[PDB]
C-alpha cells in the first residue's frame, strides 16, 4: 500500500544487527578464502553488496559451496576493509590501502567504492 | 579506524537487495507457518528485526529447523505486514489491521512497532 509509515533507522539497525551476528559467528554460512586468510560471512549479505557474490551465489552449483576461494592477486587487507564496509557502510580508506581497496572493489563489482577510490586518487594527482 | 568515510544509502540498498532475494526466493532458509499460511524468509533478517526470532535462531536445536510454527492466535495478515516491514522499513498500518499488527509485534518483540501502534490507538481515543 501507498499509505505506509517508515522507521528511518530500521535499515541501519538491521545492518548493525547483521554485523553483530557476524562478530559472534551466528549463522555464518560461507568462508571466503583470500590467500592465507579466511573470512566468515553470510552469503545473503555478500550478495546484497557485491555483483561478483550475487553471480556466485545465484549459480546452481556454487550456491551450495561453503568455501569460496578468491583470485590469489586479491589483497586480504583490501578484502577485509570491503567486508567491513558491507556490514557497516563505513570504508576505512587510507593512502596505504587505496590501491588494494580499489582493485578489490573492481573485482567484487562494488561500483560506489570504485567511484570514491577514483575520486580520492584523482585529488592527489 | 576512526578515519572511515560512509556511504549514506548503503544500509537501505542492502535491505532493498535482501527483499529482492526474498521476492525471488533466493537463499531463503526458513518457512514461518502462521495458521494456514506459509512465509519464506532468511533467518538472519528475522533475527536482526525480532527479539523472538533472535532467541529462536540462537537456540542450539531450533537454529537447525527449516520450519517454525507460530502460536495459532497470531494473525497471518499481521505477520505478513510485519515481515514486509522487516525487509523494507515500511509498515502498512491501517485502522482495520492495527490491533492485529500490534499483537503480532508484541509477540515478535518488535518494540518500535508496538510504540507507533500504541500512539496511533491513543490518538483515536
Amino acid at each position: 500500500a501507498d499509505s505506509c509509515i517508515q522507521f528511518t533507522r530500521h535499515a541501519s539497525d538491521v545492518l548493525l544487527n547483521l554485523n553483530r551476528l557476524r562478530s559472534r559467528d551466528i549463522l555464518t554460512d560461507v568462508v571466503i578464502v583470500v590467500s592465507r586468510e579466511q573470512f566468515r560471512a553470510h552469503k545473503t549479505v555478500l550478495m546484497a553488496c557485491s555483483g561478483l557474490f550475487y553471480s556466485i551465489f545465484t549459480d546452481q552449483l556454487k550456491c551450495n559451496l561453503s568455501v569460496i576461494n578468491l583470485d590469489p592477486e586479491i589483497n586480504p587487507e583490501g578484502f577485509c576493509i570491503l567486508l567491513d564496509f558491507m556490514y557497516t557502510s563505513r570504508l576505512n580508506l587510507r593512502e596505504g590501502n587505496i590501491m588494494a581497496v580499489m582493485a578489490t572493489a573492481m573485482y567484487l563489482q562494488m561500483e560506489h567504492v570504485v567511484d570514491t577510490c577514483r575520486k580520492f586518487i584523482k585529488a592527489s594527482e | 579506524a576512526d578515519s572511515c568515510i560512509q556511504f549514506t544509502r548503503h544500509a537501505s540498498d542492502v535491505l532493498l537487495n535482501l527483499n529482492r532475494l526474498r521476492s525471488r526466493d533466493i537463499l531463503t532458509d526458513v518457512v514461518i507457518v502462521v495458521s494456514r499460511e506459509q512465509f519464506r524468509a532468511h533467518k538472519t533478517v528475522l533475527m536482526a528485526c525480532s527479539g523472538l526470532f533472535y532467541s529462536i535462531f540462537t537456540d542450539q536445536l531450533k537454529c537447525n529447523l527449516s520450519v517454525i510454527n507460530l502460536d495459532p492466535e497470531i494473525n497471518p495478515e499481521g505477520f505478513c505486514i510485519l515481515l514486509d516491514f522487516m525487509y523494507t522499513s515500511r509498515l502498512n498500518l491501517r485502522e482495520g489491521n492495527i490491533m492485529a499488527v500490534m499483537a503480532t509485534a508484541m509477540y515478535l518483540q518488535m518494540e518500535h512497532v508496538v510504540d507507533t501502534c500504541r500512539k496511533f490507538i491513543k490518538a483515536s481515543e
Partner: peptide, 5 residues
C-alpha cells in the same frame, strides 16, 4: 523515529 516516506 517514524515518518511519511
Amino acid at each position: 523515529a517514524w515518518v511519511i516516506p
